[PDB]
Amino acid sequence: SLAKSPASTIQILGAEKALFRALKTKHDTPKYGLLYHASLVGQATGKNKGKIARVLAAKAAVSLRYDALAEDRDDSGDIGLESRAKVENRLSQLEGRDLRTT
């Protein structure tokens, strides 16, 4: 039931009361939810923790529905590990940029 949910839901999955009050009046929705306490979002700083909460929820949807829907799964962490490498170098490339002018 978690695997058949879209990645945006997996992003906002913990923050339902903030989400639905910010939808039932026309306000801005949260961006973290239950996924805020992941170590990668801990490594991010600024608005790009919203950004990598989004990319982490996307890769977590990929890995999660692989885990729930695979049959020849090996319990070895391969898809989760390549997804984590994707999220880590993405976090690198948006922590390398800086809004200052040098």
Partner: protein, 431 residues
């Protein structure tokens, strides 16, 4: 110019002299260990005695700090004031400070060097007088709090201008800021002089070589789309490649190999520059990892070579030098590797130099060109100079079995070269 401009010039000259108590407090509160309220109340004797303790620790780690205990960290230097002696004494103690800084550039991960260079910061004011050498020495450590500390207390030179938004900031400078720092030309000349002093006094350490090579190849990558900036940039980085190849460190030699391979694949250099580059590569080749990088470097530098003249026989001096550094087993083994490097034009030039300059080792060229596959113009030039070898000297079994290989593959091409020069019945009557 204006009066406020001329007075800013005299302020920048008199930056280090404490002319009253408030300037002395603002100028002595610039520490590298303590905060300002402790650092303003400390003495010279206190910071000297624990810096002398830390220099004894640093000297038992590395024994080249004992002469700095003799001169820069002695007890006459507690009372030695910097801006009271003349220019000649100033240049004496500033090359003393430069010697200490490029010796202790490697040690910056362990707290005795922080507590020891604390005394150079607070007695000799090297954060505002000897500041370019301080930044250049600790440039590698830019993700670390010790570089954050020297940026907070530094007065930034005009060449280091892009770090001016990372001073007194909580976040480290980024790698793109480091590439923007290195992308200047005057900064590149400054850093290559710094490396020349490093290579001269034999202090090049591998973390520095990694950082230096990374920033250099990123400068070349950034300037890869403007040929005039690449052409401004060639006699700087090829000069520092020559000065890194002219030393003894295997790490700095393969750093120069990395710089040369990125630069030759970024722009098509001249043939003679590539040949002199391989001569400088081979002229000091002593290690094994250096030999691995040197063979890969010479292969790629010959690969990135176009036009009429890419696959000539490399001349007699450089071919026998390449023979004395790399014999037959090394070349044959490296070609037998399953990773398949691209060694086309270099191996063609090598076999043509064997046919013009060795004339005994032809079974090995049969085996190696059995191993790797070449192009039509490569094997056309190979069989043309084998035809000339048959016409100059008597044709024995090694040249015969070479022509049996060149008959067993692509016999139409050897017919085309014989019909361009000679005849097939006449050549079979020859051999």
């Amino acid at each position: 110019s204006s009066l406020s401009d001329q007075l800013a010039q005299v302020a920048s000259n008199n930056a280090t002299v404490a002319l009253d108590r408030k300037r002395r407090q603002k100028l002595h509160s610039a520490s590298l260990i303590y905060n300002s309220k402790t650092a303003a109340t400390q003495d010279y004797d206190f910071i000297f005695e624990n810096a002398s303790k830390a220099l004894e620790e640093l000297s038992q780690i590395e024994p080249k700090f004992a002469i700095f205990s003799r001169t820069l960290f002695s007890e006459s230097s507690i009372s030695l004031d910097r801006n009271v002696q003349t220019k000649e004494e100033i240049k004496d103690l500033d090359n003393a400070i430069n010697a200490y800084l490029l010796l202790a550039s490697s040690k910056w991960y362990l707290a005795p060097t922080l507590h020891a260079t604390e005394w150079l910061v607070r007695r000799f004011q090297i954060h505002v007088k000897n500041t370019e050498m301080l930044l250049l020495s600790t440039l590698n450590y830019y993700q670390t709090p010790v570089f954050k500390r020297i940026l907070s207390i530094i007065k930034l030179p005009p060449l280091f201008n892009c770090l001016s938004n990372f001073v007194r900031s909580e976040k480290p400078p980024t790698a793109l800021t480091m590439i923007k720092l290195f992308n200047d030309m005057d900064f590149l000349k400054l850093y290559t002089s710094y490396l020349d002093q490093c290579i001269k006094h034999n202090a090049t350490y591998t973390n520095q070589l990694l950082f230096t090579t990374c920033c250099f190849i990123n400068v070349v990558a950034f300037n890869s789309n403007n040929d005039e900036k690449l052409n401004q940039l060639v006699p700087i980085l090829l000069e520092i490649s020559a000065k890194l190849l002219a030393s003894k460190s295997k790490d700095c030699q393969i750093a120069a190999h990395t710089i040369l391979v990125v630069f030759a694949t970024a722009l098509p250099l001249k043939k003679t520059i590539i040949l002199a580059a391989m001569e400088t590569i081979l002229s000091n080749l002593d290690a094994k990892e250096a030999k691995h990088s040197a063979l890969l470097t010479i292969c790629k530098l010959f690969q990135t070579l176009k036009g009429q003249g890419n696959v000539d026989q490399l001349p007699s001096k450089i071919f026998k030098l390449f023979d004395s550094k790399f014999d037959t087993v090394s070349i044959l083994t490296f070609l037998d590797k399953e990773d398949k490097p691209v060694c086309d034009k270099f191996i063609t030039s090598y076999t043509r130099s064997i046919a013009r300059y060795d004339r005994s080792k032809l079974n090995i060229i049969l085996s190696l060109l059995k191993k790797i596959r070449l192009e039509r113009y490569e094997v056309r030039l190979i069989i043309t100079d084998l035809i000339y070898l048959s016409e100059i000297l008597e044709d024995k079994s090694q040249l015969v079995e070479l022509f049996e290989y060149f008959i067993s593959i692509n016999e139409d091409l050897v017919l085309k070269c014989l019909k361009s020069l000679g005849l097939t019945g006449e050549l079979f009557e020859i051999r």
